[PDB]
With several copies, the nearest count.
Chain A
Amino acid sequence: LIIKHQMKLHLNELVDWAWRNGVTSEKFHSNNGSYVIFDHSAVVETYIINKNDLFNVTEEIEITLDKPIDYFLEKDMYGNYREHFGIAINDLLFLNTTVNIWLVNDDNSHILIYKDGKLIDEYMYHQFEYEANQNKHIYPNNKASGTYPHKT
């Protein structure tokens, strides 16, 4: 169960993500045409990069029982709701009692991943990911934060 996740990151977030998920050599372009070049997992050359510049990066999050999940919500068969941070699903002491497990997406939106004793397949997960936060209005805000740097 591997899920593509495309996001836009500032320079600090992009550098952090690149160093955590090792990149040997790659050039990342930004919203405003600035670029940063990683060579041998070390920053080498950066163009004129202003604040609020957005870089597009796609990361794969894979949801499996054995690997840890950053934030999930578990419902016992008795009716108790608990939340667990950064532990695998199998790491629960008594997985026998657990009925449902929902991933949490930092938007306070729950996506069902574990029901009826088995993981949710990829396509039902896509359906639930669309379905969880339908009426999510994002604030519209645009600032150019740049101008053609050279004298032309």
Chain B
Amino acid sequence: NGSHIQTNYCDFSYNGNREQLEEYNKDQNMYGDGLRIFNSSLTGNYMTVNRCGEI
């Protein structure tokens, strides 16, 4: 809804199902995703988004 999020040098890691789903299998239930932005302006560099369950 048009929020503005300023998050530089931040960490958004493991936010989801990544600890459970299989590797090298494209057809499985991927759930949970870090840093979701809808209709919003975000200005954040040098972030670190590792091992999210989805996007």
Contact = CB atoms under 8 A, between A and B. Distances in A.
Nearest to B28: A123
A33 interface: yes
Interface in A34-76: 56
B23 A31 contact: yes
Contacts, number: 18
Contacts of B48: none
A119 to B, nearest CB: 15
B54 interface: no
Chain A interface residue bracket vs B: 10 to 19
A13 to B, nearest CB: 18
B29 interface: yes
Interface string A89-125: 0000000000000000000000000000000001100
Contacts of B25: 31, 56
B38 interface: no
Interface of A: 29-33, 56, 122-123, 126-127
Nearest first, the 7 closest Cβ-Cβ pairs linking A and B are A31-B22, A29-B24, A123-B27, A33-B23, A123-B28, A31-B23, A126-B27
